[PDB]
Design a protein around this ligand. Sequence first.
Ligand SMILES: [Cu+2]
Ligand SMILES: [Cu+2]
Ligand SMILES: [Cu+2]
Ligand SMILES: [Cu+2]
Ligand SMILES: [Cu+2]
Ligand SMILES: [Cu+2]
Lengths: 329, 328, 328
Amino acid sequence: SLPRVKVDLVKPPFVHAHTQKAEGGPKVVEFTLTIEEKKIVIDEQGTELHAMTFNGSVPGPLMVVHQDDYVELTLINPDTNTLQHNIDFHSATGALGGGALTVVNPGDTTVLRFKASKAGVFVYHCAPPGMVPWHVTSGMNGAIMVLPREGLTDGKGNSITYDKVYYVGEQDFYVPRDANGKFKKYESVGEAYADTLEVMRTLTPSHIVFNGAVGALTGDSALKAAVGEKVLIVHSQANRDTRPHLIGGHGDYVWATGKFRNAPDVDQETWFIPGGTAGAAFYTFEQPGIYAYVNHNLIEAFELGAAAHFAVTGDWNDDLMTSVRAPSG
Amino acid sequence: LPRVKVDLVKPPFVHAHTQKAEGGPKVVEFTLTIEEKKIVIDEQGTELHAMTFNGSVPGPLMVVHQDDYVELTLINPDTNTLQHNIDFHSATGALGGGALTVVNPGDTTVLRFKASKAGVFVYHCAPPGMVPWHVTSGMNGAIMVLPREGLTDGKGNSITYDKVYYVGEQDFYVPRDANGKFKKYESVGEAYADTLEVMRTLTPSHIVFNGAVGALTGDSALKAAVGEKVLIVHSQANRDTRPHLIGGHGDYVWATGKFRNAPDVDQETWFIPGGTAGAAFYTFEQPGIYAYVNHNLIEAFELGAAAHFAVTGDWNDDLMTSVRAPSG
Amino acid sequence: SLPRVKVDLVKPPFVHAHTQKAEGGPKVVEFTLTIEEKKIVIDEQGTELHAMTFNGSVPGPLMVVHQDDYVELTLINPDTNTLQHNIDFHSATGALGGGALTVVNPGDTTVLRFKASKAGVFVYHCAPPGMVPWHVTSGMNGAIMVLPREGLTDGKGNSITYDKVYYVGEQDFYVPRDANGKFKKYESVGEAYADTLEVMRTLTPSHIVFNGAVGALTGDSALKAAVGEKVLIVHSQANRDTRPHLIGGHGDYVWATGKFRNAPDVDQETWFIPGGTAGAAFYTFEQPGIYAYVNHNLIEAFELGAAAHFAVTGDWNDDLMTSVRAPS
Ligand SMILES: [Cu+2]
Ligand SMILES: [Cu+2]
Ligand SMILES: [Cu+2]
Ligand SMILES: [Cu+2]
Ligand SMILES: [Cu+2]
Ligand SMILES: [Cu+2]
């Protein structure tokens, strides 16, 4: 008897249409995710792997509701998938975040409803009994943002409004190599398992990437902004620690634990998001040009793939920075 | 000052205590007996020469109130082969006690320190030149120094737990032969050279709660009920961890473990760096099996950092309901 | 046309002459950094490394200004060096922290000016296109302290003053090793690249050191303090997580993210500084003797080299800690 609404999800790093401030009282918000197992290319050398996805993407798409809305998820495992799957929302209470009520085999479908009682950004991930880390570290994870009914505060009594929100999902991949050091291909997802478990046990990723590949958020695919634009960056990591840093920027407000009822940290150079968490950072760009957004373990960033770009339009501010004498003899 | 003697218990249970103090400061007396012994740590029967306080991994949780004094009798029997001591993160001076408590086999020592600062703190062995070997062999525990007036939400309002559990997370470094089988050794001394080589790689063979894979599952699950308020103390002497309660949250969390600081609320996952104790306070609102993990899920499901909760009571349809159950 | 000042920089762990409170309005503060490539010895076994340094030290020297002052840096790359270099300030806004405006080949010089518009400690590092991690993990990093114009405060409005500030740069090195396990040597810095890149890809450092070498801040080089002295410890790590602990001590006030407008954590046993960050801990010594300052992954500390000593003079306090019975 509550008013129902239907969300059309979009591929990251973009986010579906939503309001910051809620319009009316509680809604039931309907989402559908279709599980897809498939081969993807994750680097410039052509390295491929059998990814396990929600809605065809790594990471899974960002779901947005407000506090005390109800989420109603349709989860679909088409008969062309080979494996069992489910979904665990960190935003929900009971039955392993819904893991225990959503076990779906190839050909099956389920529907889960939970109250979003708590404001913040949370991880969702697959967690099928006896093969949890294999599904999560194959790209079967995403995030949900639950906004306060009255939108965001600076935790010091003042309302704040973003112009745009991007979702950056970070993925640790564990691809086996042969004697030479070349990455290996496998005919089916099943045949990759034993060799993949050997690599996971070393706790050393082969690749760490944003939006499912080395360079996925650079070139044509760089994140667009402008001087004076307020931008919110949601960052998730289902399995492993990371330390985001905007090169040439700061985090004006950062919820590192990702929970908006807590006052944010201010003036951040680098922030910390533990494995199993989603964080968020609010920034106002003050300087045009190319910016890098990285994991500031710089081997993880520049060797293993954990690096994106922003392209920012606008006028240079000489007061903030100026070259007095350019490099020369 | 008045004197009290405490009877310590095996983790994850905690000795009798009160949240609020009764009367003024006390000298609280504890005894720990060092015990070197063989323990099994996984279901393939892997063995390890553990080094323990009171014969458990981790050591027992000690409980006092702020500005009480701790008087510790540390006994190293003549059946142990090694030199030992204790360092308390709760104490001020002499490497936390380390430099006043060096006991060889057959020796006894008594340390007294004032518990000036409120919070949960790591205690561990730290013998000159052998520090990480003893600590990663299980020789560590924790101490909870409660505020005289019990716990608050950092907003003036007192909060009261029904039950407290201590979870000790241990990283172990067991050597292998050329086959990839774990090695056994006749004495503890013979394990050193090979153990120091695995530690150099910073990759544990096992990460466990309460001394072994499966230690806090099945019969040994942690018991709770819908409406019960529970405090979970979690310690790691050597390596970072990220606790998560699967199907739950942390309503009040002290990630750094020091109660004069205002807690974080509505937490999914929280962060305890190596060399720290933390505490999370939760009220259960749903029944069933919960998992409590280190949310590096490779560390949890493959290396052994996983516990279960069994929770009794009535299911709440408003919070979560299966609309259509899984089928074609 | 504000007033100009010139700074003379010192070798860490010491810090150049500064005031906690600003004397007057905004200034333009001039610093000079001369890049130097050279061989250094990082352990007691004479392991050598081709280091990449700002002003010939690892870390580089601590720069100190006040909020809303301007930093004017002259960066010199002499013709005796072989590589391209530059500088990125985490404290600056635009052009990759200054990295895109400061690219100096051997024989080149550049001058950069930025407003220090935000209070805190911040990392500075070399970041040349396609060579970033190699330069940073070769020791080409330091930090800058942008003090608030009114000096440091606790959270709750009250002013706090240190008698001494020390700077601890933590460096993760990745030195290649041949099958037997002996550390390799190279004729030039360019010959070490290919083999160093392979060690880096394992994310496993060969060494972790304070002030450029195992035991660089022990013995004659121990940090000096006295009972009653207030000490600020700035700690940076440009690449990798660390978890500092003062063994026998605490952090009375900690800014773990290193940004002073945020309220500090109190009564910390162990604090956490993520890779790419500077943090700061304020402590008043209560007890004399030898203290250890460590990264509390004790493998990283005692086996890999992340360990320093304080020498503290003064009177022992029996109240805080006493030996009732000595080991026998
Ligand atoms: Cu799955
Ligand atoms: Cu999870
Ligand atoms: Cu011991
Ligand atoms: Cu310690
Ligand atoms: Cu350089
Ligand atoms: Cu940087």
